[PDB]
């Protein structure tokens, strides 16, 4: 009568293009079909002569190399790449960007957290891990993500880039690296600044302007959870906090600095979200809206709502804990 | 390491181009992935804007509409379509045919036995079945295969021709009808003569000449299982005879006429093959070799070897019956 799960119904194909898409409904293989579809639908399979079979193997290998972390997992990977896919449609990015650029944006989005250990850079550096030693305390996680990405692509079976002349590869690889390395939150302010600076007299044919825009785009998708509808956004926060508490417990247990923002004893869902939405998320999207007006209605709207929802929740949190003493 | 069965190895993708391909090793879902690969690899998806998912849904629906016959089943249609794909490479057919021609050839190969009951035309006509009545004793099975083919494509989610302009559709539809109908073995000698007549002075840009070549090609692929290595060829013969025996049993049991060549009592495997190879297969391929010289060494040769092998088995079979029969 009807078809297997991995064949996407036309309703799904439609919803995939929109930020309201419910990421929680799907299972690993379903998600892999979606990612696969994105590559065809954006015409990347066509313009880069990607063998459609290689692509499936690549996607599967990528899935294997994500870990069973509360937040930094394949579902998140999928979530980021889906957001990226929405923005290509919403902002008509194919008008402003070459196909190469779109290829870079999508691949980097899929790859950006490969083999995340579930503990942040500060953990690596303070605990003097293999990765910190290997990368000399310079964005060890992001370097490793990027290294794993190209290890997968160096494998013949998984090499979606096999039909691209060497000079194209070099350009793609350089783009991915920049993008994946830019997801390190430590660099946030720096990148924001450079962007804001160039944002004063922006030129779509100045390569350094474009590079920064791509950087901002991936950063946007990276932390775009709070942009999604409340039902979808809310569980992600719990997962993130779960991961943070796991780290601080270890850090406490081994005698390493604990970040207050990760401390089980100091942190509440609302206080965590409020400053983050208000001071990191909102300003970042505000700046993007100057280039793409539609972003306000689609991205800023629900962020404002989330801000208000969490501010109100804090009032509640405060009133309740006040009650329990005086 | 561990890729699912339905992700085809690069070795598999490779062997798919040769007529030595072992059709028996594969589960339905793998056979589906192979047929999918063919449409991409030949540029059919590209040149006809076939929605990659619709292709998959279409293939699945086609699968659903094949029956569980000993011979006339989905593995057979896969086998036929795989042989056709080999022809395209072996004989460099893309230098001779439009992409529209290829699409007709592939699609008709896939659709050519849809919903086969396991009883041939002679059975339908003599038993006055519903199909024989519907089609007035004119190639009733083949007509039925077609109708199902187009009933499948009439479903929007299965319609791999959605983005083909109406003229193109009419042209494809006409081609497919001609080819599927040419698979009725009652017409074999008629078609051979027409082709041989054209063969005296063959014109690659005469439409009548090409229509006939395409008819011969589908006919070749249809009975081509006999051209594969012994290990692959022989089981098919047992399957066909199972179907034949099932029918002749019914015909005896219902007082209908029985064809000698389908008779449990009159037929040996060896004697059936020798006859078929000598008076149907070899002459057909011999005349095709005059247009495509490479066919001799890769079809005709295995056929000669086969004919010799079965001649040996016959000597041994005869000796066995010389011990029974009282
Ligand atoms: C406060 C900030 C440095 C830590 N931080 C973060 O890095 N990401 C990605 C979040 O989604 C987030 N939410 C609260 N804090 C967060
Ligand atoms: C009965 C059999 C020896 C003849 N025969 C046949 O008629 N068709 C259609 C085949 O595909 C086939 N394959 C092997 N023999 C075959
Ligand atoms: Cl506001
Ligand atoms: Mg990260
Ligand atoms: Mg038939
Ligand atoms: Zn991330
Ligand atoms: Zn057949």
Curated annotation (Swiss-Prot), chains A, B:
It catalyses: 3',5'-cyclic GMP + H2O = GMP + H(+). Mg(2+) binds at residue 113. One of its GO terms (molecular function) is identical protein binding. Its cofactor is Zn(2+); Mg(2+). Its EC number is 3.1.4.35. Changing residue 116 to A: Reduces catalytic activity, but has no effect on substrate affinity. Residues 1-317 form the PDEase domain. Changing residue 261 to A: Induces a 2 fold change in inhibitory sensitivity by BAY-73-9961. Binds 1 Zn(2+) ion per subunit. Binds 2 divalent metal cations per subunit: site 1 preferentially binds zinc, while site 2 has a preference for magnesium. Tightly binds zinc. Changing residue 276 to A: Induces a dramatic change in inhibitory sensitivity by BAY-73-9961. Keywords: Cell membrane, Cell projection, cGMP, Cytoplasm, Endoplasmic reticulum, Golgi apparatus, Hydrolase, Magnesium, Membrane, Metal-binding, Phosphoprotein, Zinc. One of its GO terms (cellular component) is plasma membrane. GO terms for biological process: cAMP-mediated signaling; cGMP catabolic process; cGMP metabolic process; negative regulation of neural precursor cell proliferation; positive regulation of cardiac muscle hypertrophy; positive regulation of long-term synaptic potentiation; signal transduction. Expressed in all tissues examined (testis, brain, small intestine, skeletal muscle, heart, lung, thymus, spleen, placenta, kidney, liver, pancreas, ovary and prostate) except blood. Highest levels in brain, heart, kidney, spleen, prostate and colon. Isoform PDE9A12 is found in prostate. In brain, present in the cortex, cerebellum, and subiculum (at protein level). In heart, primarily localizes to myocytes. Zn(2+) binds at residues 76, 112-113, 222. Specifically hydrolyzes the second messenger cGMP, which is a key regulator of many important physiological processes. Highly specific: compared to other members of the cyclic nucleotide phosphodiesterase family, has the highest affinity and selectivity for cGMP. Specifically regulates natriuretic-peptide-dependent cGMP signaling in heart, acting as a regulator of cardiac hypertrophy in myocytes and muscle. Does not regulate nitric oxide-dependent cGMP in heart. Homodimer. This is High affinity cGMP-specific 3',5'-cyclic phosphodiesterase 9A. The chain holds residues 241 to 566 of 593 of the full protein.
């Amino acid at each position: 009568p009807t078809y297997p799960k991995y064949l996407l119904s036309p309703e799904t194909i439609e919803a995939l293009r929109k930020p309201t898409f419910d990421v929680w409904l799907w299972e690993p293989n379903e998600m892999l079909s979606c990612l696969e579809h994105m590559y065809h639908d954006l015409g990347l399979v066509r313009d880069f002569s990607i063998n459609p079979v290689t692509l499936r193997r690549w996607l599967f290998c990528v899935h294997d190399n994500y870990r069973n972390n509360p937040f930094h997992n394949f579902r998140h990977c999928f979530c980021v790449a889906q957001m990226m896919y929405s923005m290509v449609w919403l902002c008509s990015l194919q008008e402003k960007f070459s196909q190469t650029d779109i290829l870079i944006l999508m691949t980097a989005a899929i790859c950006h957290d490969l083999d995340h250990p579930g503990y942040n850079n500060t953990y690596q550096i303070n605990a003097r891990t293999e990765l910190a030693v290997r990368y000399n305390d310079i964005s060890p996680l992001e370097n490793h993500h990027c290294a794993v990405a190209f290890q997968i692509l160096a494998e013949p079976e998984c090499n979606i880039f096999s039909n691209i002349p060497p000079d194209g590869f070099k350009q793609i690889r350089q783009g991915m690296i920049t993008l994946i390395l830019a997801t390190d939150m430590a660099r946030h302010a720096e990148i924001m600044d450079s962007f804001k600076e160039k944002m004063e007299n922006f030129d779509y044919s100045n390569e350094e302007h474009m590079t920064l825009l791509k950087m901002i785009l991936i950063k946007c998708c990276d932390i775009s959870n709070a942009v999604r509808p409340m039902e979808v956004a809310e569980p992600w926060v719990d997962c993130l906090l779960e991961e943070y508490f796991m780290q601080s417990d270890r850090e406490k247990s081994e005698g390493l600095p604990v970040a207050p923002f990760m401390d089980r004893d100091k942190v509440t869902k609302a206080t965590a979200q409020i400053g983050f939405i208000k001071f990191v998320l909102i300003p970042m999207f505000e700046t993007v809206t100057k280039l793409f007006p539609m972003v306000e209605e689609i991205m800023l709207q629900p962020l404002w709502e989330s801000r208000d929802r969490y501010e109100e929740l804090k009032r509640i949190d405060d009133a309740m804990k006040e009650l329990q003493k005086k």
